[PDB]
Amino acid sequence: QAKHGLNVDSSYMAWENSRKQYIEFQQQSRQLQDLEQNGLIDSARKVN
Amino acid sequence: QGQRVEAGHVIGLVGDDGSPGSYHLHWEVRDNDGYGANGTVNPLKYMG
Ligand SMILES: [Zn+2]
């Protein structure tokens, strides 16, 4: 369907949502690393 | 950079950047992370 261009309009919304979710996940990971560097979260809690 | 070091951790080796031939260590204690003489405390008096 994407190849023939039928569902590009419908799929764009889900594609953007997935991209935003992935960016949020990356930002959360970097935020957790920065939190460790600051010290607010211990190494044991970071693994969890 | 950004590493948590405990007391007694090895930091590095001494250099001779100031006076070649004789090695020394420039040791300075501050209350801020600046680069000037405004906020400097004598290390010997501080550790005393
Ligand atoms: Zn000096």
Give kind and range of the element (H or E) at residue B30.
strand B29-30
Query: d(Cα A14, Cα A1) in Å, to the nearest integer?
Result: 15
Question: How many whole angstroms from B2 Cα to the centroid of ligand 1?
Answer: 25
Q: Which of B4, B13, B6 is nearest to A36 (CA)?
A: B4
Instruction: Measure the CA dihedral B38/B39/B41/B47, to 10°.
Output: -160
- What residue has token string 């935020």? A31
- Closest residue by Cα to residue A35 from B12, B30, B2: B2
Whether the CB-CB separation of B15 and B4 falls below 8 Å is answered with no
Q: Which residues pair with B30 in a beta bridge?
A: B40
How many angstroms does the Cα of residue B29 sit away from the middle of ligand 1?
Answer: 13
- Helix residue ranges per DSSP H, B1-48: 43-47
CA distance B37 to B14: 23
Report how far residue B23's alpha carbon sits from residue A23's, in angstroms, rounded to the nearest whole number.
50
For residue B24, give the DSSP letter.
Answer: B
Rounded to 5°, angle at Cα B40 from B38 and B44: 165
**Rounded Cα gap, residues B15 and B22, in angstroms:** 8
Beta partners for A48? none
CA of B46 to the centre of ligand 1 (A): 17
- The one-character DSSP state at B15 is B
